[PDB]
Amino acid sequence: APRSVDWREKGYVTPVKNQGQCGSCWAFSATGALEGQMFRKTGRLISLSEQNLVDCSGPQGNEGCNGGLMDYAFQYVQDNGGLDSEESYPYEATEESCKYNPKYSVANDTGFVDIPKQEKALMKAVATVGPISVAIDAGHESFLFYKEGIYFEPDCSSEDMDHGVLVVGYGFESNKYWLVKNSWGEEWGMGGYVKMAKDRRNHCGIASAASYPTV
């Protein structure tokens, strides 16, 4: 695999979004991954609707602003036969009634792949598939106060992850890190991104729950 990868360079990633005070990170992580896969398949980058996922993927196991999984989101899209665009189905940061409209569907998937729980495997996926959905332990104030540099939290857990984010690449500094897209707005961290310790024994469990939708 390459020494470094940054899918933002090839137009696979939309601008940073903000989930607000709602446990919908799994939804933003899911749309981020689909946005990347739909781009590789059609050459068109279209911001997807997290709200659509929040209001309708309950049957698949998601709990709106109370949490969920990226995989459940992917499963919903497959079951649903589509997913509305961010433009047609705006984000409200609160659970509402399902308002899915197939006429505005701009994305779709035929399932998902769960990556082996190894950083080595996550690297291959990132290098050969595009942005990957992952979960990390972001429950420390060090993460809340993150501004710049390679994020390393000594008290991080590789077992219990509580924040779904998006890996858009990886690299090293002149020391290795994963390029992670968060959904807390562009004012947090590095323009909404965070460089997290890579090859430091699955730091914060970044490779424990990795996956992506198949298009």
Ligand SMILES: NC(N)NCCC[C@@H](NC(=O)[C@H](CSCc1ccccc1)NC(=O)Cc1ccc(-c2ccccc2)cc1)C(=O)N[C@@H](Cc1ccc(O)cc1)C(=O)NCCc1ccccc1
């Ligand atoms: N321990 C487990 N697991 N608990 C479940 C967690 C539920 C849900 N995730 C959240 O609620 C996240 C937790 S972030 C860390 C934090 C921990 C403590 C205090 C405070 C902050 N909240 C947010 O991002 C909200 C948010 C917080 C802060 C600012 C912000 C930004 C700048 C300045 C000031 C404030 C802006 C926005 C969630 O569903 N997370 C998923 C992540 C995941 C994990 C594995 C995976 O494979 C995919 C996704 C999850 O844990 N899912 C497993 C649980 C589940 C399953 C089905 C249905 C419901 C819940």
